[PDB]
Design a protein around this ligand. Structure first.
Ligand SMILES: C[C@@H]1O[C@@H](O)[C@H](O)[C@H](O)[C@H]1O[C@H]1O[C@H](CO)[C@@H](O)[C@H](O[C@H]2O[C@H](C)[C@H](O)C[C@H]2O)[C@@H]1O[C@H]1O[C@H](CO)[C@H](O)[C@H](O[C@@H]2O[C@@H](C)[C@H](O[C@H]3O[C@H](CO)[C@@H](O)[C@H](O)[C@@H]3O[C@H]3O[C@H](CO)[C@H](O)[C@H](O)[C@H]3O)[C@@H](O)[C@H]2O)[C@H]1O
Lengths: 211, 212
């Protein structure tokens, strides 16, 4: 049916430039506008600009005229957006959307995440979170880049697990995961969280010990 | 230029009607502002809903309609469904820019309300060794998914050194969030009582610990 296919995740350093693309499927590329939208973690949505591939007319948000360059290749049915002089503020998820008369986005792409960082790949420090039903946790502190996976007892403990979204403390991420088990079960049955960080090929198991 | 203003959160029940409004700091919204409404569901899933003030996008249910109600653009959901729980953004074409409202979080009560389970964990000894101290507050199983988190250290409000996450939908459709208070081991050692206070639906749940 209609499909707006986006490029994947990008990691870039301050001062660089990146090119993102959106490929159309299911319609006449030249009769519609392609708009680009920025979603910053909790800064809402911002419109960057739009291109009409039929004749490459463009509209830009004034704020982004120095940052973005929009293009489209009508044989390849691809629109591109180039962002120059990346700063930390350009870290966001970007969407391309299909627009027409009176609207900017009836069909949306899936988003491309862009992180602009000066950090080096860093493995997590994993700390056990005992109290002393009971809730146990693990803190996965100080890793770069995303993601880390957390399992509990190599996957056997699947019920009552909550792994939270990572926050950025300094330029490194911190996330935690909790598991709630019946009080009779612990410490009798060992509970261990297993943290894997593929970018630094780290795999660490931390047994939760009563304090 | 314009500031577009939307309600920040609304709650309704299945089968009821709810109206969301979108207004501009330039005065009235007109047909030439082409008001658009879109929906964001978890994991960055966006759907176009309404375009050009009142046209439903392809495949959008008839229960969603857009209109200008006086000076404002509005989205009415006649007979709201549990799956309509989502964030709704309107945008206005003004001065050749699409300007976005801040989003309305709409709760359509699909299950009974649920108060948060709050757990506060102290720093681990192995992290205290590194000269850092993070207290972790986990908040799960709350519905509606709107919560405010406050930290106090020996009764004084903390508004430096804490990070809270945005509420995430759990697989059982209630919500979870965590908050971190990070301190140096030294500063940890200077205080006795630490509290994480979570308010949900006008009631606060508080969890406190003492360094000792
Ligand atoms: C540029 C491009 O070129 C080729 O590629 C191809 O031909 C494209 O189709 C073409 O695209 C333009 O034209 C299409 C119309 O066929 C239109 O669909 C396009 O817009 C779409 O895409 C963009 C990127 C957006 O996402 C909106 C989509 O609708 C695109 O339109 C844009 O460019 C044209 C160029 O001719 C116009 O400038 C167009 O503007 C519209 O018309 C003007 C007159 C509207 O302004 C009125 O409303 C404002 C808000 O009330 C007000 O501030 C203005 O003063 C003006 O108001 C008038 O009515 C008032 C009462 O309501 C007062 O009486 C006032 O005095 C009156 O002037 C504007 O909002 C648009 O609706 C622009 O969008």
């Amino acid at each position: 049916e209609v499909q707006v296919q986006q490029s994947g995740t990008v990691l870039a350093r301050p001062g660089a430039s990146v090119k993102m693309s959106c490929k159309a499927s299911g319609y006449t590329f030249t009769n519609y506008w392609m708009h680009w939208i920025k979603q910053r973690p909790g800064q809402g949505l911002e419109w960057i600009g739009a291109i009409y591939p039929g004749n490459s007319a463009t509209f830009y948000n004034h704020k982004f005229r120095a940052k973005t360059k929009l293009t489209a290749v009508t044989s390849t049915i691809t629109a591109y957006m180039e962002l120059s002089s990346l700063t930390n503020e350009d870290s966001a998820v970007y969407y391309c959307t299909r627009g027409g008369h009176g609207y900017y986005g009836d069909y949306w792409g899936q988003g491309a995440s862009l992180t602009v960082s000066s950090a080096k790949t860093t493995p997590p420090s994993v700390y056990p979170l005992a109290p002393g039903m009971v809730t146990l946790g693990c803190l996965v502190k100080g890793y770069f880049p995303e993601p880390v996976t957390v399992t509990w007892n190599s996957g056997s403990l699947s019920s009552g697990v909550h792994t939270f979204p990572a926050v950025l403390q300094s330029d490194l991420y911190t996330l935690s995961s909790s598991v709630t088990v019946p009080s009779s079960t612990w410490p009798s049955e060992t509970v261990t969280c297993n943290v894997a960080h593929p970018a630094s090929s780290t795999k660490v198991d931390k047994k939760i010990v009563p304090r | 230029q314009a500031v577009v203003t939307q309600e920040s959160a609304l709650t309704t029940s299945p089968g009821e009607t709810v109206t969301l409004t979108c207004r501009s700091s330039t005065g009235t919204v007109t047909s030439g502002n082409h008001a658009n409404w879109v929906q964001e569901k978890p994991d960055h899933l966006f759907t176009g809903l309404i375009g050009d003030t009142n046209n439903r996008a392809p495949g959008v249910p008839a229960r969603f309609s857009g209109s200008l109600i006086g000076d404002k653009a509005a989205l009415t959901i006649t007979g709201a469904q549990p799956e309509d729980e989502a964030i709704y953004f309107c945008a206005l074409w003004c001065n050749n820019h699409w300007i976005f409202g801040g989003g309305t979080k709409l709760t359509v009560l699909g299950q009974p309300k649920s108060s948060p389970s709050v757990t506060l964990f102290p720093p681990s000894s192995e992290e205290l060794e590194t000269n850092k101290a993070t207290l972790v507050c986990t908040i799960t199983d709350f519905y509606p998914g709107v919560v405010t988190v406050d930290w106090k250290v020996d009764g004084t409000p903390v508004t430096q050194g804490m990070e809270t996450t945005q509420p995430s939908k759990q697989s059982n459709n209630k919500y979870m969030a965590s908050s971190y208070l990070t301190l140096t081991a030294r500063a940890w050692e200077r205080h006795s009582s630490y509290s994480c206070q979570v308010t949900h639906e006008g009631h606060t749940v508080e969890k406190s610990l003492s360094r000792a």
